[PDB]
Ligand SMILES: CN1CCN(c2nc3ccccc3s2)CC1
Ligand SMILES: CN1CCN(c2nc3ccccc3s2)CC1
């Protein structure tokens with residue numbers, strides 16, 4: 001059975017379990033069950049399932065080199081699929097809430113969930129809460145007897161917390177740290193002294209890399225009972241590295257990829273986000289360019305945004321990106337080599353993860 | 361050491377742990393640590409701590425009848441305090457998000473957290489996410505070696521899920537179930553056919569009773585390793601019963617308690633909530649009264665709200681409340697008697713919980 005075919009089949013099974021449980025144990029009525037079914041499909045489906053499929057792919061790699069009864073192979077693949085859906089539903093939670101938090105309009109060519117006419121923000125915040133609650137329902141049901149349940153739940157929590165801390169770093173990245181204060185309305189930075197590579201890397205590490213790369217890789221190891229085949233410090237280093245490159249690509253696409261391709265109108269400039277483009281531009285601009293950036297960044301005015309986009313183009317950030325990518329390619333390959341020491345199979349899975357990231 | 365004194369001391373210890381961990385493991389800077397410290401204090405402190413103290417009180421009851429070394433008594437009391445704070449932080453999460461969802465203005469005489477000038481909804485949604493994440497950080501840290509960790513985490517999840525499902529029932533309680541549809545903007549019911557005692561009881565059971573009564577009582581049993589001293593079906597029945605009475609009191613106060621005493625301006629009428637007052641009024645109104653209620657309920661117009669308040673007063677719902685309370689007093693006492701069969705100590709703790717609920 002092909003990997004994606006199995007993964008999608010498990011979605012239907014998990015969805016049926018969750019909705020049937022809501023009827024048998026939570027007194028749900030059929031119309032609310034239908035609401036939640038539509039909410040699940042709308043928020044969890046339609047992507048490429050890269051995070052969930054990484055769990056499956058890691059587990060398949062170990063299956064090829066480990067002796068098991070057929071029923072055990074099937075159990076491991078089913079576990080990897082459920083775990084992959086835990087990650088996809090966790091991402092769904094983040095995307096629903098982030099879209100509300102940022103006042104976003106579109107995601108993947110369709111309206112953000114909170115903007116659907118019969119949803120609204122009042123329901124959508126709670127729908128997002130439910131999406132994350134469903135990840136825990138999945139784990140306690142499907143993994144109740146598994147030796148890895150404890151380690152999996154502990155990992156999932158730590159990843160979730162790191163991601164929420166990362167969201168805090170992201171939403172406050174255009175403030176001056178010394179001015180943060182619940183009592184005082186927050187002005188945008190004027191000096192941009194905190195738009196540095198180290199601060200950018202901290203934002204991205206926490207807001208993206210734990211749930212997009214560390215979680216799927218480690219969950220694949222856990223459902224495979226293979227965490228001893230790897231040096232965990234190496235898995236963390238390579239996950240944070242690939243994850244940062246993934247976010248840098250996203251940052252570049254927000255500015256330069258056409259809306260129809262992006263599936264949304266990017267507003268990192270109007271939102272004054274600490275993007276890779278802003279940080280890298282400031283790391284090479286002269287005094288006049290810095291001043292013109294300061295006069296235009298973080299404003300909704302289309303003329304001011306266009307000015308920022310000119311400044312980026314004229315700064316030849318394409319060359320900086322090729323240099324960054326060359327260094328990431330160098331460093332990921334080095335970490336993969338270190339991973340072959342204890343597991344050529346896992347190192348090959350990481351290699352596949354990197355190719356899928358690098359090509360898109 | 362007095363119970364409340366110990367409970368508050370543990371707050372400072374937990375807060376110090378969480379913030380110190382954010383510095384040592386999450387790369388936090390001192391200004392964001394201060395933001396989160398203020399957010400924690402503002403959202404978690406200032407109430408009566410009834411839920412958290414119930415854990416402590418249940419554990420103290422067992423301590424009085426169970427042989428332990430002194431260090432073990434101290435460990436149990438510390439565990440009960442941490443568990444109580446897990447519940448208070450979970451409530452803090454719900455209140456932050458509910459206030460955003462409902463567009464609330466005040467809570468306990470102070471602005472809702474999202475309305476603080478340097479917070480805003482963009483930060484406050486995530487602050488609420490962090491509050492719940494902190495409950496899991498607490499459990500995995502303080503209870504890492506405890507035999508009850510698994511049972512406690514599983515219970516906490518189920519309670520959280522039931523509460524989120526309850527919030528869905530609450531926010532959709534003024535819609536017609538057959539009309540729910542993400543694609544279509546939701547009109548308020550016109551027939552109010554779903555304002556029934558059974559439907560009201562389902563809302564309250566899920567939205568309030570699991571986290572306010574079932575969770576503190578069962579957590580007290582868990583940290584005491586005393587779940588065998590009770591019939592769990594009885595604990596559930598008494599928790600749901602007391603919890604419903606608690607919410608009925610809240611519903612009555614929303615309408616009739618002065619704002620300065622309530623700590624907010626109640627808007628259940630303008631919000632068209634399925635309150636105990638609306639359900640009970642419809643369960644005794646004549647045809648003309650039903651019509652006048654339909655013409656006025658769920659509108660912000662102060663004259664229409666006053667009309668609804670007149671209809672309630674003229675309907676003598678005070679008599680219905682005294683009848684409801686008399687029946688609850690009857691039924692709680694019956695369940696306490698059944699609880700004495702296996703544990704007079706736990707039955708006495710439940711009795712204390714009921715008195716604290718009944719008097720306020
Ligand atoms: C690729 N982006 C990574 C950061 N994302 C987050 N959204 C939330 C929402 C709530 C809590 C944490 C996070 S992190 C948005 C998508
Ligand atoms: C006609 N436009 C020319 C410039 N655009 C850019 N692509 C990148 C990629 C990486 C970093 C910066 C840029 S700017 C593409 C479309």
Ligand SMILES: CN1CCN(c2nc3ccccc3s2)CC1
Nearest residue numbers: 454455457458523524527567568
């Ligand atoms: C006494 N009320 C019980 C119901 N409350 C809830 N708020 C939320 C928020 C998010 C998820 C679930 C719930 S339940 C508000 C206070």
Ligand SMILES: CN1CCN(c2nc3ccccc3s2)CC1
Nearest residue numbers: 612616672673676677678679681
């Ligand atoms: C001057 N007002 C008289 C009526 N108010 C009510 N108190 C309750 C309590 C339980 C049920 C209904 C009502 S109406 C108190 C203040």
Ligand SMILES: [Zn+2]
Nearest residue numbers: 098099102170
């Ligand atoms: Zn965002």
Ligand SMILES: [Zn+2]
Nearest residue numbers: 250251254268
């Ligand atoms: Zn982006």
Ligand SMILES: [Zn+2]
Nearest residue numbers: 458459462530
């Ligand atoms: Zn509410």
Ligand SMILES: [Zn+2]
Nearest residue numbers: 610611614628
């Ligand atoms: Zn209320």
